[PDB]
Design a protein around this nucleic acid. Structure first.
Ligand code: MG
Lengths: 187, 194, 297, 114, 213, 184
RNA sequence: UCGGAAUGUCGCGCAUU
RNA sequence: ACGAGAACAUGCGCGACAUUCCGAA
């Protein structure tokens, strides 16, 4: 915690407020914080050779936000990740609590990267997908199908998005990936 | 003795009301209903009354003050306006969303391009039940204070609440359901708003 | 001594802060309630000394449907992090938690069962400067939006005349508002005062241990005997004087240090209405009388 | 979910024996017309003009069956004529909005599976 | 404080089209629905549209600062009327034009004659080398529709009221000939302002001498 | 900023068809009278003016026209947007033409394809915006050329088959606002 | 009857924060 | 004598620009 965090965190827009034992407080760019949290989970699994997992709470707050409020909310997310089998990360709000593998692969590698590459190949379209997905109406799924037909993307990826939206606990991962992508593409 | 007068009524948003916090309005953090913060109503009424009467002793006596040597308790406790149950059912019917997304543009003066903005506004049909407490401190000064309150309400009805109401978003109308002296034996029957 | 229970259902979000405006808290201590009651008595032109001497109120405690919550006893646990993070115990389980049999997962479930409110932070702005060639300034106010069936309750132990005085005072305080932004839309609540049988039976129990329910501080002589073998949490209580007559400008109260609710003492002590005003035109009263609940450890 | 199943079963890309958006537009325009007619109005039961124009939509469904076999097989497989029948039987706004939603899901799935 | 309220009807001359997303009429057909107040599902001219068009026209008429970058660099009359936001030089807007809602008279007259309050105008674009026509549908409020328009003028300087209302005269005239929002260059949005009342609801300012048209 | 408004009477030599979805001619939902869409007039003048002058071999984006037509009918190029000095209004059915039609047993439209019968007149209304004092007259001559072309050519429908030609006569040329001289 | 079924652009920015 | 008290999340901003319901029969 004290030493190898400098090496692991290297190359990120991150200042390590404190490591000091089993815990860790980290401040940086939101995307760099999430990426280094995943890299940290992998490196910690390598360091402990399994046999030990750490839970995390990741928050996204603007600057000049009350630092007391910031740390308290991040600790609240950490506590939300604590409940259960404890091998979880609460990303942003308390509804987005995912296993480390689920966040690393199912949300980012499997969903965020292909969606981002599709968007680059072709923002408001992501917004309307979010509006259709967050609602539970079946005809919202129908409208999502129509939108994916209209999107002029690779139709294999639109069928993949349909499959992700249909499956329970896969729609949540898709929503989190789309929110990550939207936050990635802003001004 | 000390008296508290309760003024309970409705605020009918005659236009889309946008009280910021894309560009979402403030909402009750639990029920996610649109709300009008009490600070918003108090500040708008205070600004309008200050403009009308021109801080002044009347303004500080009404809305409170913290200046040295002139600490005054706020006689007007303007509680948060909540999305009323009647309008809640009126919007549960017709399957109407309480808020709406209004798209707006801004043509530049040089390149003639526009920046689209999606501002959220509470739908016209909404009604927020408001409940404000007037703290009768000086029995002599109650009449003038209520006259100033009525003047501020009249100005607000010809004005807008929070948001860019100079562009139309925020006009409201008050409907005083009842005025009753909840605390004390003060006579509030002759007192009225609007 | 009558021991009426008062239930407070908050219509609007309520702003409580331990240290800052943007900070939000779900309950307040007995002192903060007493300061409101004292302000209300002064406004209502009621008698101050009677309420000062007789009333013994407790910290405001969370309550939801089918449950009343009490502060976690600071009792040694003969799986401890779940107890440490736990804050409030249901009344029906309270004596249970005193005897034992409460395990880590059950305590965690009790902590999750706390269905009282939802903290949030509303951001507002000040335009008092833009007119005078200036600019607006944003400020954050924390608040707690209580759930429809939830709210804050507190017991009061006084004479019949004291209880009637409390009834009138809380009737006025319903519209006066309790909180740190009561004049800006927050803190509005409605109260109902009645005698609760479960609490009367719980207080009727006389165990070997005494548990504080109110933010209390013993007089020095009583503190000599009470502090032995005691397990407690000593909260620092500070604030600003709120009165038009105290001084020209608002000044801070003298820092006070009082035992938090739930602190367990093997020797009871009667508290004191301490004076935390210095060079003020009136004496500011901070409540520290102890409302005791006896239990068996 | 029945619309997606019907569209998938009729896959062959050829959908509904050659049905396209250009064949659908002629009737779906009337469908969305009556949809706007009900959406503007606020009443639990169907307005009489809505009933009359829905009957006209049904006979237009039959006429489009006569015009192109692809439209005809679309209507017989998706039961949309039977759906306008049953909603006329119910004469309520909820059901007819549900039927317009059903047709929207049908065309959406048809576009997606192409 | 004195506020001068103008209430009247803005009458459409050629199909008025203020765009905006939402629950589209003729779902899957039109590509530019008109902005409709969700409560009544009636076409409505947003007051922001009227204010922006009037401000742009008045700025063009008075004069444009060469290479202007922001709205707060306009003429002092423009900033005084429609508001300014210069950092440390903020002037509160005197014109508080509300959304012009659909009038009840035009509601009842369009209920008669079986009007739908809107038309789905068909247009198309033709290329210059391939001569291929690409069609399109745009919703328009039918010209017979009239909107109850309601604006408020704040009296902050007694001396400058006459100049402010003269500038409002110029802006209203320009907007009357110019098109309101939409593709009015192709004939979508010609409007005419009919004024019913210019009265000082609050205050004591003499508004009898004031006329905006 | 000055606006010069010209109001004139299009007179229909042979029956014209601008119907939107042959298809019935486009009719005003309010007056139920045949109406010449303004966008059709504007597009026809712009296309005729473009084809009259020399053009680049490929106009993919529809915006690469001659600078005079570009400033007259507007721009869409990213960063070089010019507002159209010419605003075209919808020419509705003239009151005089309508009354002449009720005088006889003559309908406003015929079947041939719903074609607005010949002899009808539409009151067209055009606005020119003054942006360059030294350019106003040069733009007006291009508008005249366009008008002249629109007299020789048609306006919508099967024009190459002999339907849709009209003639432009101007009742008055006056500046409706501004210090610009109308009689010039 | 056959085609085209919208397309090109911005897609919030600027004060306080 | 309620970490209190005073404070509008507000100020400026057009969903807008280019577009033949048309190619032929
Ligand atoms: Mg730890």
């Amino acid at each position: 915690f004290k030493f190898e965090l400098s090496n692991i965190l290297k190359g990120a827009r991150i200042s390590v407020i404190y490591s000091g034992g089993d815990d860790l407080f980290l401040i940086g760019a939101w995307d760099d914080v999430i990426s280094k949290a995943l890299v940290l989970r992998k490196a910690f699994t390598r360091f402990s050779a399994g046999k030990l997992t750490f839970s995390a709470g990741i928050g996204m707050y603007p600057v000049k936000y009350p630092i007391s409020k910031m740390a308290s909310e991040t600790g609240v997310l950490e506590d939300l990740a604590k409940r259960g089998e404890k091998n979880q990360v609460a990303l942003w709000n308390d509804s987005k609590v995912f296993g480390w593998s689920q966040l690393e692969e199912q949300i980012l590698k499997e969903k965020m990267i292909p969606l981002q590459e599709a968007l680059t190949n072709s923002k408001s379209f992501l917004y309307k997908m979010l509006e259709l997905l967050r609602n539970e109406d079946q005809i919202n799924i129908a409208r999502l199908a129509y939108l994916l037909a209209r999107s002029s993307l690779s139709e294999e990826l639109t069928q993949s998005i349909f499959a992700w939206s249909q499956n329970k606990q896969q729609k949540v991962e898709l929503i989190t990936a789309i929110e990550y992508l939207v936050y990635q593409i802003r001004e | 003795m000390y008296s508290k007068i309760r003024i309970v009524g409705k605020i009918d948003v005659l236009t889309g009301l946008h009280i910021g916090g894309a560009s979402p309005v403030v909402r009750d953090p639990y029920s996610r209903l649109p709300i009008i913060p009490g600070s918003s109503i108090k500040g708008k009424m205070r600004s309008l009354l200050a403009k009308h009467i021109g801080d002044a002793p009347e303004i500080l006596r009404l809305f409170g003050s913290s200046q040295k040597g002139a600490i005054q308790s706020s006689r007007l406790q303007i509680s948060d306006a909540f999305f009323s149950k009647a309008s809640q059912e009126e919007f549960d019917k017709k399957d109407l969303a309480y808020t709406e997304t209004k798209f707006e543009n801004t043509i530049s003066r040089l390149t003639a391009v526009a920046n689209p903005r999606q501002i959220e506004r509470v739908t016209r049909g909404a009604s927020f039940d408001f409940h404000i407490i007037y703290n009768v401190e000086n029995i002599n000064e109650v009449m003038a204070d209520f006259e100033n309150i009525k003047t501020a309400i009249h100005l607000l009805e010809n004005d807008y609440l929070g948001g860019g109401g100079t562009r139309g978003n925020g006009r409201i109308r008050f409907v005083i359901d009842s005025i009753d002296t909840v605390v004390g034996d003060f006579d509030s029957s002759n007192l009225s708003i609007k | 001594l009558v021991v009426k229970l008062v239930k407070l259902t908050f219509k609007s979000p309520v702003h409580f802060g331990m240290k800052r405006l943007s900070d939000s808290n779900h309950t307040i201590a007995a002192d903060t309630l007493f300061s409101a009651l004292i302000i209300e008595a002064l406004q209502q032109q009621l008698e101050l000394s009677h309420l000062l001497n007789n009333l013994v109120i407790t910290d405001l405690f969370p309550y939801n449907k089918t449950s009343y919550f009490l502060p976690k006893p600071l009792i040694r646990i003969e799986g401890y992090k779940a107890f440490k993070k736990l804050t409030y115990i249901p009344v029906e389980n309270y004596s249970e938690y005193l005897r034992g049999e409460i395990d880590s997962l059950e305590a965690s479930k009790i902590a999750e069962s706390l269905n009282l409110g939802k903290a949030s932070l509303s951001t507002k702005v000040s335009l008092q400067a833009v007119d005078h060639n200036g600019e607006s300034e944003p400020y954050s106010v924390g608040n707690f939006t209580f759930y429809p069936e939830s709210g804050l309750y507190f017991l009061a132990k006084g004479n019949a005349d004291t209880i009637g005085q409390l009834e009138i005072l809380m009737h006025a305080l319903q519209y006066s508002g309790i909180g740190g932004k009561r004049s800006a839309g927050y803190g509005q609540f409605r109260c109902t005062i009645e005698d609760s049988g479960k609490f009367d039976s719980l207080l009727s129990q006389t165990g070997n241990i005494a548990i504080l329910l109110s933010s209390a501080m013993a007089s020095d002589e009583e503190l000599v005997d009470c502090l032995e073998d005691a397990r407690y949490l000593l909260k620092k209580r500070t604030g600003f004087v709120q009165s038009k007559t105290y001084a020209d400008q608002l000044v801070k109260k003298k820092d006070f240090y009082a035992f938090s609710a739930g602190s367990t003492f093997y020797q009871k002590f009667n508290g004191k209405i301490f004076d935390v005003s210095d060079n003020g035109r009136h004496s500011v009263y901070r409540y520290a009388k102890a409302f005791w609940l006896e239990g068996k450890i | 979910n029945f619309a997606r199943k019907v569209v998938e079963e009729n896959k062959r890309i050829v959908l509904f024996n050659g049905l396209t958006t250009s064949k659908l537009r002629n009737l779906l325009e009337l469908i969305n017309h009556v949809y706007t007619k009900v959406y503007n109005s606020d009443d639990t039961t169907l307005s009489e003009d809505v009933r009359d124009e829905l009957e006209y939509l049904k006979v237009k469904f039959a006429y489009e069956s006569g015009r192109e076999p692809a439209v005809r097989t679309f209507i017989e497989k998706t039961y949309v004529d039977k759906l306008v029948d049953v909603v006329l039987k119910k004469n309520t706004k909820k059901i007819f909005l549900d039927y317009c939603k059903y047709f929207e899901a049908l065309v959406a799935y048809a576009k997606f599976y192409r």
